[PDB]
Amino acid sequence: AEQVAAERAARKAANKEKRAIILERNAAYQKEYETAERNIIQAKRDAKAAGSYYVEAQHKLVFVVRIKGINKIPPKPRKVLQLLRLTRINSGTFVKVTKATLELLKLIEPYVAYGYPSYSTIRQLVYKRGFGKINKQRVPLSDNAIIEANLGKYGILSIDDLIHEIITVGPHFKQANNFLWPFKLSNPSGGWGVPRKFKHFIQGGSFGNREEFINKLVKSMN
Amino acid sequence: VLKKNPLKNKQVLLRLNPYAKVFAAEKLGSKKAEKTGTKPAAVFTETLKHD
Amino acid sequence: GKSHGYRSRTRYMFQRDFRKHGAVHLSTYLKVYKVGDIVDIKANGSIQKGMPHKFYQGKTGVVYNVTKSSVGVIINKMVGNRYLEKRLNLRVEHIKHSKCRQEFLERVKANAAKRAEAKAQGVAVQLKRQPAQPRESRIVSTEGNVPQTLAPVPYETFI
Amino acid sequence: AKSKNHTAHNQTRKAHRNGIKKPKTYKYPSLKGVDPKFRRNHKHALHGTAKALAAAKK
Amino acid sequence: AISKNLPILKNHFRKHWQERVKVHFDQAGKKVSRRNARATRAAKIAPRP
Amino acid sequence: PSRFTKTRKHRGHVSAGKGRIGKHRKHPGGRGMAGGQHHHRINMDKYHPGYFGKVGMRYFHKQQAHFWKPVLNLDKLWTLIPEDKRDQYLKSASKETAPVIDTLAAGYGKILGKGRIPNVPVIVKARFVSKLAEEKIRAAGGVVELIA
Amino acid sequence: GIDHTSKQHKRSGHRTAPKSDNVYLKLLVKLYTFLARRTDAPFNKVVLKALFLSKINRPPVSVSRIARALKQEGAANKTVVVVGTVTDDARIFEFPKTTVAALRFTAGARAKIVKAGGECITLDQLAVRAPKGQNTLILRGPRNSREAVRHFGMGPHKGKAPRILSTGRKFERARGRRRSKGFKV
RNA sequence: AAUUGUUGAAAGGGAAGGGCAUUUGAUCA
RNA sequence: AAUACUGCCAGCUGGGACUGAGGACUGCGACGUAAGUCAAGGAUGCUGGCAAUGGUUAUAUGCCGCCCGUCUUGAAACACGGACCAAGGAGUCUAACGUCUAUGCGAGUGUUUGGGUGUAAAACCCAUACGCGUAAUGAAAGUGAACGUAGGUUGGGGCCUCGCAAGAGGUGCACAAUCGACCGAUCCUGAUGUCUUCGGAUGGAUUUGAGUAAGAGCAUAGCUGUUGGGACCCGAAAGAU
RNA sequence: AAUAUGUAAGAAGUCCUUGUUACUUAAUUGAACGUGGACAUUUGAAUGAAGAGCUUUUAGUGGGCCAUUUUUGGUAAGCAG
RNA sequence: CCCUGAAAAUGGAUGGCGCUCAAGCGUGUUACCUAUACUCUACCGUCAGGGUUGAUAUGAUGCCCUGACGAGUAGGCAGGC
């Protein structure tokens, strides 16, 4: 019984090959991100310069957090919240923007705050409070092996791949979002910034759509 | 047995993202953009301050 | 006392439409009804034989029986905390076809046609429908469309 | 000594505690309420096709 | 008095039945006494059966 | 029994498992079968239909001896014969020598046709026989003897 | 707090380990638990689950039923497995050779199998011969054939064996069962 | 045990009694 | 050009509080060409003091704190009982049962009505009868369940074969619905024969049953529920001898 | 109008050929049940699901009140509905 | 905004003390304190998903791993003195 070293060496070789593929894919994703951001910036610049206005495409991904307790909730909004996986206060989920999802959010707007997330806050959320759902259990994600095992059928095998699927909605965004447990955030470190949370954002509260302002609140709560 | 947080433990960050070493080496977090310059059209310039 | 009859509180329900009284157009009697077809129920006031009840007005059901001039409809009625099936025989007059099922057969035929044509080469059939996706990027040109400045109007006391 | 007559409060919650269930559907539905002549001819046709299938494939 | 899906039972205990309860606690004693009486009779009646 | 009785666990609870709004009073619905057409009519119609009313005529002094007609189906016909000879008479299927069963002596007064008895000669004696049973026995090759 | 969508701390609703205190039954349950845990054949898991069934959930299986099951195509050379008791049927006359494994065997059924040419083995022997349940066929008796299930679900227009003690005339045959005395059921 | 008398200890601006934590007094491995 | 504002850093670093769970190695990573090392699936090293910390109780301090049990939508109430302690005190038993569970036997099942025996109300043994089930339907007379591999079809665990796997084919116990076959009652039609009025073969039903369709039952014990009994305990104004 | 509400968004499906009937049609003309045969990436809108379905037993319950909105009787009511 | 309209019976209520470029009134911006609320950790119990007869070694109703939850009258079940 001396083959333990042979299996050890084979495991190391396989791990090194896997790490090489992961590094190549991560470099490709970073290059794509930089290219896309620069392309949008220059497109806005040329539209401004050519006597025109650049109408940005509507954001396809939003982050929704629950800012209301589980008491005094009407049954239809309560059911919508359960279907959207918001059963604890200060719980957040990612949502792909469609007509059905927009009408769903319009119903439980009074009890949630949602807005367009950014790559930095998405990465921070996934790194810090990123938890998976394996065998109906909340197993923390501290290695790419678990992610590859539970998501390799969809072409996702690393935490960076999962973050990429979250930020850019693709063919397997539904499964990528379903694999992730809803993020249990804490109260904001710097406070909510308003005297009354249960008022609309235009009316001076946390209730309602915050658009790009959701990033600051999410990072404060995370 | 215990969850260690990325972005605070360099070993765990490097284990999760092998590209982190290359990112730190190339300083991709602070990259200077191309020094291109375009001038807005007179129509937009006047519409900005048209009262 | 109290009154809850077979035609109670149907004054505006079992009533013919404005300028649509008289006999029934000879098109309903020419419709062919088969077992399994989905039909809607709409009572007609001119014919008082085989009229449906108030609850079954506007409900949609499958056809399970064919008779001389009548068809049987299975309607799921919610009583208590369960749905119970109800087999009710109604005349042809107070029953019309449902276009949602016809749209479903049309979509199925187009679905199969696309499954044949696209898969003849085998690339991105995408046979499934999608909701209203967010609009992509667009560029607007102010060539003859200079934005006009708008300001709120003063309050007026017109009578 | 008068008392409350009728109220529908909490009835919806009571009915929804045990979720309202759609009736269980089967491939072969009940053949009751169907035209007796059609049922008789269906029985005859079923016997005929069963005999034909038994004679053809064994 | 009347309840869910249970059978109908006809219990005939409505008079002063508590005063007329006969419990045969002396089954073994009666058997022993009968055997002793049989032996005594057999001895008395001579070898006759 | 007493140790496993729920009263011991109910000790301490004020109502002792009988409720507070409605206490465990005496018979509130009546004694015995009080009410079968007034207030318990719903249960008496949905669980015990047919309790109230008369059905047939009257048979005074009905002795349960004239109706003593025990039944015995055809499948359980060879069980009356002892096992030690049952196999022998099963393999010996000849008309000149066949096993004989006395159903009256066995305690059965009527024989019914059900079981598809094996095609062997046999003799059966019974007070009453059925048409199907007799036809099956004669088709097998046996005969039915009428005894009293 | 959590707006629970389901009952908290709810049991699975299935019976784990037998409720009986039969030492041999517990030993057999332990053996089949070991098998089903360290093997991959679903037969071991099915047998282990059936071992927890109650008396009413474990109806007897007759030798006639065994013969009928073995009469199927390709089932002649198969090992019959009955999780329960195997009874003897006198309505059958020809019993083919087989191999039946069951917990308890009726004396008449065992004699019938021995005379036919088969053998009566236990679940432990069945496991020893076929650890993965190869070439086996599981037989279960009729569960809804009990006399206590006829009375279940009694209601109007159902005909579900009303709970009675005596049978005959003037015993729940009056008004409520005939159209001449009012309504029929 | 309820109740009562002495000895020894403590508290007592129109009640006593309890919980959250500690100082002080008595006692304790 | 600089600056204000917003967003990013897989940029660095200063200060403070809580926590030390796990117990020879197993995995994922980094540094190091390589030995080996590491902040890498949960804290170690060094040093100081004592051999006081801490547990129980009384008082004191800061805050909080309405009287136990019942009725009630609403109790602390100016609603009800309680001055205290000690002793007793309230869902028990019988007969027939319903669901479930356990045991034994099993188309059979139950010794203890009784007899023999007995270390003597203990324990052991036993023949015929009898209770329930194996056949039910009609008021009754009466009759009485395989055209079939005990039917056809769907869903169906398991098993077998092919298949690297996945998947494909066959058989498919149990169970769900439906269509069929047979038995009893009712409505009908009516084959030979004949004590001319008896006999009821064969073919059907939008009819009907607490049926058959390879039996599942019997005995005892246990939780809970119902009935009758005084019936969880206590209490009437009354009636009769 | 808004709100509220029913049905459909597929393998129990679609399509090709043809076996049965005592139904029906002038009629292999229609209806039902079928046999054989073709369509598994993307099984036919989005989301979710400590899994879903089914059976038995039974304790307690059958005097309610209050809050936003709609609203009846009453001038109003911590009034009744 | 303030003033007259504006009067009820024991002595009293923005809680009172009190407050006048307010400590009163409307609005705009930061910092500060806290719920048995939220995030993490330590322990207990319950449930779910599993590993552990290759042993001397016993309690596989035993041991261990991971995840989630823990209110409550009448009432039910289970484990214990």
PDB file of all heavy atoms in Angstrom, chain I residues 159-168:
ATOM      1  P     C I 159     -34.349  -3.480  -7.999  1.00  0.00           P
ATOM      2  OP1   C I 159     -33.151  -3.793  -7.179  1.00  0.00           O
ATOM      3  OP2   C I 159     -34.336  -2.298  -8.897  1.00  0.00           O
ATOM      4  O5'   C I 159     -34.693  -4.764  -8.878  1.00  0.00           O
ATOM      5  C5'   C I 159     -34.854  -6.039  -8.274  1.00  0.00           C
ATOM      6  C4'   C I 159     -35.402  -7.050  -9.249  1.00  0.00           C
ATOM      7  O4'   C I 159     -36.728  -6.648  -9.690  1.00  0.00           O
ATOM      8  C3'   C I 159     -34.624  -7.221 -10.542  1.00  0.00           C
ATOM      9  O3'   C I 159     -33.478  -8.044 -10.400  1.00  0.00           O
ATOM     10  C2'   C I 159     -35.673  -7.792 -11.484  1.00  0.00           C
ATOM     11  O2'   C I 159     -35.879  -9.174 -11.227  1.00  0.00           O
ATOM     12  C1'   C I 159     -36.921  -7.029 -11.038  1.00  0.00           C
ATOM     13  N1    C I 159     -37.142  -5.807 -11.846  1.00  0.00           N
ATOM     14  C2    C I 159     -37.539  -5.919 -13.188  1.00  0.00           C
ATOM     15  O2    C I 159     -37.699  -7.049 -13.677  1.00  0.00           O
ATOM     16  N3    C I 159     -37.734  -4.791 -13.912  1.00  0.00           N
ATOM     17  C4    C I 159     -37.552  -3.594 -13.351  1.00  0.00           C
ATOM     18  N4    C I 159     -37.756  -2.508 -14.100  1.00  0.00           N
ATOM     19  C5    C I 159     -37.150  -3.453 -11.991  1.00  0.00           C
ATOM     20  C6    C I 159     -36.962  -4.573 -11.286  1.00  0.00           C
ATOM     21  P     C I 160     -32.181  -7.777 -11.311  1.00  0.00           P
ATOM     22  OP1   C I 160     -31.090  -8.662 -10.833  1.00  0.00           O
ATOM     23  OP2   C I 160     -31.962  -6.310 -11.379  1.00  0.00           O
ATOM     24  O5'   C I 160     -32.617  -8.279 -12.759  1.00  0.00           O
ATOM     25  C5'   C I 160     -32.911  -9.647 -12.998  1.00  0.00           C
ATOM     26  C4'   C I 160     -33.359  -9.878 -14.419  1.00  0.00           C
ATOM     27  O4'   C I 160     -34.623  -9.200 -14.656  1.00  0.00           O
ATOM     28  C3'   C I 160     -32.444  -9.332 -15.504  1.00  0.00           C
ATOM     29  O3'   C I 160     -31.327 -10.163 -15.770  1.00  0.00           O
ATOM     30  C2'   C I 160     -33.390  -9.182 -16.685  1.00  0.00           C
ATOM     31  O2'   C I 160     -33.644 -10.442 -17.288  1.00  0.00           O
ATOM     32  C1'   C I 160     -34.667  -8.717 -15.983  1.00  0.00           C
ATOM     33  N1    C I 160     -34.766  -7.239 -15.947  1.00  0.00           N
ATOM     34  C2    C I 160     -35.060  -6.544 -17.125  1.00  0.00           C
ATOM     35  O2    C I 160     -35.231  -7.185 -18.173  1.00  0.00           O
ATOM     36  N3    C I 160     -35.145  -5.194 -17.089  1.00  0.00           N
ATOM     37  C4    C I 160     -34.954  -4.540 -15.943  1.00  0.00           C
ATOM     38  N4    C I 160     -35.048  -3.208 -15.953  1.00  0.00           N
ATOM     39  C5    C I 160     -34.653  -5.223 -14.730  1.00  0.00           C
ATOM     40  C6    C I 160     -34.572  -6.557 -14.777  1.00  0.00           C
ATOM     41  P     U I 161     -29.937  -9.512 -16.246  1.00  0.00           P
ATOM     42  OP1   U I 161     -28.917 -10.590 -16.293  1.00  0.00           O
ATOM     43  OP2   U I 161     -29.690  -8.303 -15.419  1.00  0.00           O
ATOM     44  O5'   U I 161     -30.224  -9.036 -17.740  1.00  0.00           O
ATOM     45  C5'   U I 161     -30.493  -9.982 -18.764  1.00  0.00           C
ATOM     46  C4'   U I 161     -30.868  -9.313 -20.063  1.00  0.00           C
ATOM     47  O4'   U I 161     -32.094  -8.550 -19.896  1.00  0.00           O
ATOM     48  C3'   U I 161     -29.881  -8.295 -20.609  1.00  0.00           C
ATOM     49  O3'   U I 161     -28.769  -8.879 -21.265  1.00  0.00           O
ATOM     50  C2'   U I 161     -30.758  -7.454 -21.525  1.00  0.00           C
ATOM     51  O2'   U I 161     -31.010  -8.136 -22.744  1.00  0.00           O
ATOM     52  C1'   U I 161     -32.059  -7.402 -20.722  1.00  0.00           C
ATOM     53  N1    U I 161     -32.120  -6.195 -19.866  1.00  0.00           N
ATOM     54  C2    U I 161     -32.348  -4.981 -20.488  1.00  0.00           C
ATOM     55  O2    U I 161     -32.509  -4.863 -21.690  1.00  0.00           O
ATOM     56  N3    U I 161     -32.387  -3.894 -19.651  1.00  0.00           N
ATOM     57  C4    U I 161     -32.219  -3.899 -18.281  1.00  0.00           C
ATOM     58  O4    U I 161     -32.280  -2.840 -17.655  1.00  0.00           O
ATOM     59  C5    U I 161     -31.984  -5.192 -17.713  1.00  0.00           C
ATOM     60  C6    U I 161     -31.943  -6.269 -18.505  1.00  0.00           C
ATOM     61  P     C I 162     -27.349  -8.125 -21.257  1.00  0.00           P
ATOM     62  OP1   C I 162     -26.343  -9.035 -21.863  1.00  0.00           O
ATOM     63  OP2   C I 162     -27.123  -7.587 -19.892  1.00  0.00           O
ATOM     64  O5'   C I 162     -27.557  -6.892 -22.245  1.00  0.00           O
ATOM     65  C5'   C I 162     -27.771  -7.102 -23.633  1.00  0.00           C
ATOM     66  C4'   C I 162     -28.136  -5.824 -24.348  1.00  0.00           C
ATOM     67  O4'   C I 162     -29.355  -5.265 -23.783  1.00  0.00           O
ATOM     68  C3'   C I 162     -27.138  -4.681 -24.249  1.00  0.00           C
ATOM     69  O3'   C I 162     -26.024  -4.820 -25.113  1.00  0.00           O
ATOM     70  C2'   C I 162     -28.006  -3.472 -24.559  1.00  0.00           C
ATOM     71  O2'   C I 162     -28.268  -3.386 -25.952  1.00  0.00           O
ATOM     72  C1'   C I 162     -29.304  -3.852 -23.845  1.00  0.00           C
ATOM     73  N1    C I 162     -29.336  -3.312 -22.466  1.00  0.00           N
ATOM     74  C2    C I 162     -29.514  -1.934 -22.285  1.00  0.00           C
ATOM     75  O2    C I 162     -29.653  -1.212 -23.284  1.00  0.00           O
ATOM     76  N3    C I 162     -29.531  -1.430 -21.031  1.00  0.00           N
ATOM     77  C4    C I 162     -29.378  -2.241 -19.982  1.00  0.00           C
ATOM     78  N4    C I 162     -29.403  -1.701 -18.761  1.00  0.00           N
ATOM     79  C5    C I 162     -29.192  -3.645 -20.136  1.00  0.00           C
ATOM     80  C6    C I 162     -29.176  -4.132 -21.384  1.00  0.00           C
ATOM     81  P     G I 163     -24.558  -4.395 -24.606  1.00  0.00           P
ATOM     82  OP1   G I 163     -23.623  -4.513 -25.754  1.00  0.00           O
ATOM     83  OP2   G I 163     -24.275  -5.134 -23.350  1.00  0.00           O
ATOM     84  O5'   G I 163     -24.700  -2.848 -24.245  1.00  0.00           O
ATOM     85  C5'   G I 163     -24.724  -1.860 -25.265  1.00  0.00           C
ATOM     86  C4'   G I 163     -25.199  -0.524 -24.747  1.00  0.00           C
ATOM     87  O4'   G I 163     -26.441  -0.691 -24.009  1.00  0.00           O
ATOM     88  C3'   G I 163     -24.286   0.187 -23.758  1.00  0.00           C
ATOM     89  O3'   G I 163     -23.196   0.861 -24.367  1.00  0.00           O
ATOM     90  C2'   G I 163     -25.253   1.116 -23.043  1.00  0.00           C
ATOM     91  O2'   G I 163     -25.589   2.222 -23.867  1.00  0.00           O
ATOM     92  C1'   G I 163     -26.481   0.213 -22.923  1.00  0.00           C
ATOM     93  N9    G I 163     -26.421  -0.562 -21.673  1.00  0.00           N
ATOM     94  C8    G I 163     -26.272  -1.921 -21.542  1.00  0.00           C
ATOM     95  N7    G I 163     -26.223  -2.309 -20.298  1.00  0.00           N
ATOM     96  C5    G I 163     -26.334  -1.135 -19.566  1.00  0.00           C
ATOM     97  C6    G I 163     -26.344  -0.930 -18.163  1.00  0.00           C
ATOM     98  O6    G I 163     -26.252  -1.770 -17.258  1.00  0.00           O
ATOM     99  N1    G I 163     -26.476   0.417 -17.847  1.00  0.00           N
ATOM    100  C2    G I 163     -26.587   1.437 -18.759  1.00  0.00           C
ATOM    101  N2    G I 163     -26.705   2.667 -18.241  1.00  0.00           N
ATOM    102  N3    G I 163     -26.583   1.264 -20.074  1.00  0.00           N
ATOM    103  C4    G I 163     -26.453  -0.043 -20.400  1.00  0.00           C
ATOM    104  P     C I 164     -21.686   0.541 -23.910  1.00  0.00           P
ATOM    105  OP1   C I 164     -20.777   1.404 -24.704  1.00  0.00           O
ATOM    106  OP2   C I 164     -21.506  -0.933 -23.935  1.00  0.00           O
ATOM    107  O5'   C I 164     -21.613   1.018 -22.388  1.00  0.00           O
ATOM    108  C5'   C I 164     -20.786   0.333 -21.453  1.00  0.00           C
ATOM    109  C4'   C I 164     -20.148   1.268 -20.452  1.00  0.00           C
ATOM    110  O4'   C I 164     -19.273   2.207 -21.128  1.00  0.00           O
ATOM    111  C3'   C I 164     -21.094   2.150 -19.650  1.00  0.00           C
ATOM    112  O3'   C I 164     -21.667   1.474 -18.545  1.00  0.00           O
ATOM    113  C2'   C I 164     -20.203   3.314 -19.235  1.00  0.00           C
ATOM    114  O2'   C I 164     -19.423   2.969 -18.100  1.00  0.00           O
ATOM    115  C1'   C I 164     -19.269   3.441 -20.443  1.00  0.00           C
ATOM    116  N1    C I 164     -19.670   4.513 -21.387  1.00  0.00           N
ATOM    117  C2    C I 164     -19.688   5.859 -20.987  1.00  0.00           C
ATOM    118  O2    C I 164     -19.393   6.175 -19.824  1.00  0.00           O
ATOM    119  N3    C I 164     -20.046   6.807 -21.885  1.00  0.00           N
ATOM    120  C4    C I 164     -20.362   6.466 -23.134  1.00  0.00           C
ATOM    121  N4    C I 164     -20.706   7.440 -23.981  1.00  0.00           N
ATOM    122  C5    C I 164     -20.340   5.111 -23.572  1.00  0.00           C
ATOM    123  C6    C I 164     -19.987   4.182 -22.676  1.00  0.00           C
ATOM    124  P     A I 165     -23.262   1.340 -18.423  1.00  0.00           P
ATOM    125  OP1   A I 165     -23.572   0.276 -17.434  1.00  0.00           O
ATOM    126  OP2   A I 165     -23.779   1.237 -19.810  1.00  0.00           O
ATOM    127  O5'   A I 165     -23.731   2.738 -17.814  1.00  0.00           O
ATOM    128  C5'   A I 165     -23.376   3.121 -16.492  1.00  0.00           C
ATOM    129  C4'   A I 165     -23.210   4.617 -16.378  1.00  0.00           C
ATOM    130  O4'   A I 165     -22.322   5.080 -17.428  1.00  0.00           O
ATOM    131  C3'   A I 165     -24.476   5.445 -16.559  1.00  0.00           C
ATOM    132  O3'   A I 165     -25.228   5.561 -15.361  1.00  0.00           O
ATOM    133  C2'   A I 165     -23.942   6.780 -17.062  1.00  0.00           C
ATOM    134  O2'   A I 165     -23.464   7.569 -15.981  1.00  0.00           O
ATOM    135  C1'   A I 165     -22.745   6.338 -17.903  1.00  0.00           C
ATOM    136  N9    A I 165     -23.072   6.208 -19.336  1.00  0.00           N
ATOM    137  C8    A I 165     -23.124   5.051 -20.074  1.00  0.00           C
ATOM    138  N7    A I 165     -23.432   5.238 -21.335  1.00  0.00           N
ATOM    139  C5    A I 165     -23.590   6.612 -21.436  1.00  0.00           C
ATOM    140  C6    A I 165     -23.922   7.447 -22.517  1.00  0.00           C
ATOM    141  N6    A I 165     -24.161   6.999 -23.751  1.00  0.00           N
ATOM    142  N1    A I 165     -23.999   8.776 -22.283  1.00  0.00           N
ATOM    143  C2    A I 165     -23.758   9.224 -21.045  1.00  0.00           C
ATOM    144  N3    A I 165     -23.438   8.540 -19.949  1.00  0.00           N
ATOM    145  C4    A I 165     -23.369   7.224 -20.213  1.00  0.00           C
ATOM    146  P     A I 166     -26.796   5.203 -15.334  1.00  0.00           P
ATOM    147  OP1   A I 166     -27.244   5.215 -13.919  1.00  0.00           O
ATOM    148  OP2   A I 166     -27.000   3.983 -16.156  1.00  0.00           O
ATOM    149  O5'   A I 166     -27.497   6.422 -16.083  1.00  0.00           O
ATOM    150  C5'   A I 166     -27.350   7.760 -15.625  1.00  0.00           C
ATOM    151  C4'   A I 166     -27.568   8.743 -16.748  1.00  0.00           C
ATOM    152  O4'   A I 166     -26.558   8.531 -17.771  1.00  0.00           O
ATOM    153  C3'   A I 166     -28.892   8.608 -17.491  1.00  0.00           C
ATOM    154  O3'   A I 166     -29.957   9.300 -16.858  1.00  0.00           O
ATOM    155  C2'   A I 166     -28.558   9.136 -18.879  1.00  0.00           C
ATOM    156  O2'   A I 166     -28.525  10.555 -18.882  1.00  0.00           O
ATOM    157  C1'   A I 166     -27.134   8.619 -19.054  1.00  0.00           C
ATOM    158  N9    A I 166     -27.109   7.267 -19.642  1.00  0.00           N
ATOM    159  C8    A I 166     -26.864   6.106 -18.955  1.00  0.00           C
ATOM    160  N7    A I 166     -26.895   5.030 -19.692  1.00  0.00           N
ATOM    161  C5    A I 166     -27.180   5.512 -20.957  1.00  0.00           C
ATOM    162  C6    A I 166     -27.344   4.849 -22.180  1.00  0.00           C
ATOM    163  N6    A I 166     -27.236   3.522 -22.300  1.00  0.00           N
ATOM    164  N1    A I 166     -27.623   5.603 -23.266  1.00  0.00           N
ATOM    165  C2    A I 166     -27.725   6.931 -23.111  1.00  0.00           C
ATOM    166  N3    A I 166     -27.594   7.669 -22.008  1.00  0.00           N
ATOM    167  C4    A I 166     -27.315   6.889 -20.949  1.00  0.00           C
ATOM    168  P     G I 167     -31.479   8.848 -17.109  1.00  0.00           P
ATOM    169  OP1   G I 167     -32.355   9.688 -16.253  1.00  0.00           O
ATOM    170  OP2   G I 167     -31.546   7.369 -16.999  1.00  0.00           O
ATOM    171  O5'   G I 167     -31.752   9.243 -18.629  1.00  0.00           O
ATOM    172  C5'   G I 167     -32.786   8.611 -19.370  1.00  0.00           C
ATOM    173  C4'   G I 167     -32.277   8.088 -20.690  1.00  0.00           C
ATOM    174  O4'   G I 167     -30.916   7.607 -20.533  1.00  0.00           O
ATOM    175  C3'   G I 167     -33.034   6.900 -21.264  1.00  0.00           C
ATOM    176  O3'   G I 167     -34.205   7.280 -21.966  1.00  0.00           O
ATOM    177  C2'   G I 167     -31.986   6.226 -22.142  1.00  0.00           C
ATOM    178  O2'   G I 167     -31.856   6.909 -23.380  1.00  0.00           O
ATOM    179  C1'   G I 167     -30.713   6.457 -21.326  1.00  0.00           C
ATOM    180  N9    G I 167     -30.408   5.329 -20.423  1.00  0.00           N
ATOM    181  C8    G I 167     -30.168   5.430 -19.075  1.00  0.00           C
ATOM    182  N7    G I 167     -29.917   4.286 -18.505  1.00  0.00           N
ATOM    183  C5    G I 167     -29.994   3.366 -19.539  1.00  0.00           C
ATOM    184  C6    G I 167     -29.817   1.959 -19.524  1.00  0.00           C
ATOM    185  O6    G I 167     -29.548   1.227 -18.563  1.00  0.00           O
ATOM    186  N1    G I 167     -29.982   1.409 -20.790  1.00  0.00           N
ATOM    187  C2    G I 167     -30.275   2.118 -21.928  1.00  0.00           C
ATOM    188  N2    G I 167     -30.405   1.417 -23.062  1.00  0.00           N
ATOM    189  N3    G I 167     -30.446   3.430 -21.953  1.00  0.00           N
ATOM    190  C4    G I 167     -30.292   3.990 -20.735  1.00  0.00           C
ATOM    191  P     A I 168     -35.598   6.529 -21.688  1.00  0.00           P
ATOM    192  OP1   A I 168     -36.699   7.426 -22.122  1.00  0.00           O
ATOM    193  OP2   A I 168     -35.575   6.016 -20.295  1.00  0.00           O
ATOM    194  O5'   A I 168     -35.567   5.278 -22.674  1.00  0.00           O
ATOM    195  C5'   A I 168     -35.575   5.455 -24.084  1.00  0.00           C
ATOM    196  C4'   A I 168     -35.325   4.153 -24.801  1.00  0.00           C
ATOM    197  O4'   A I 168     -33.987   3.679 -24.497  1.00  0.00           O
ATOM    198  C3'   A I 168     -36.232   2.997 -24.405  1.00  0.00           C
ATOM    199  O3'   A I 168     -37.481   3.022 -25.073  1.00  0.00           O
ATOM    200  C2'   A I 168     -35.384   1.776 -24.738  1.00  0.00           C
ATOM    201  O2'   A I 168     -35.415   1.509 -26.133  1.00  0.00           O
ATOM    202  C1'   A I 168     -33.986   2.274 -24.373  1.00  0.00           C
ATOM    203  N9    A I 168     -33.623   1.938 -22.982  1.00  0.00           N
ATOM    204  C8    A I 168     -33.402   2.823 -21.958  1.00  0.00           C
ATOM    205  N7    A I 168     -33.087   2.252 -20.822  1.00  0.00           N
ATOM    206  C5    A I 168     -33.105   0.897 -21.118  1.00  0.00           C
ATOM    207  C6    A I 168     -32.855  -0.241 -20.332  1.00  0.00           C
ATOM    208  N6    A I 168     -32.527  -0.192 -19.040  1.00  0.00           N
ATOM    209  N1    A I 168     -32.955  -1.448 -20.928  1.00  0.00           N
ATOM    210  C2    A I 168     -33.277  -1.500 -22.228  1.00  0.00           C
ATOM    211  N3    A I 168     -33.537  -0.501 -23.070  1.00  0.00           N
ATOM    212  C4    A I 168     -33.431   0.686 -22.447  1.00  0.00           C
TER     213        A I 168
END
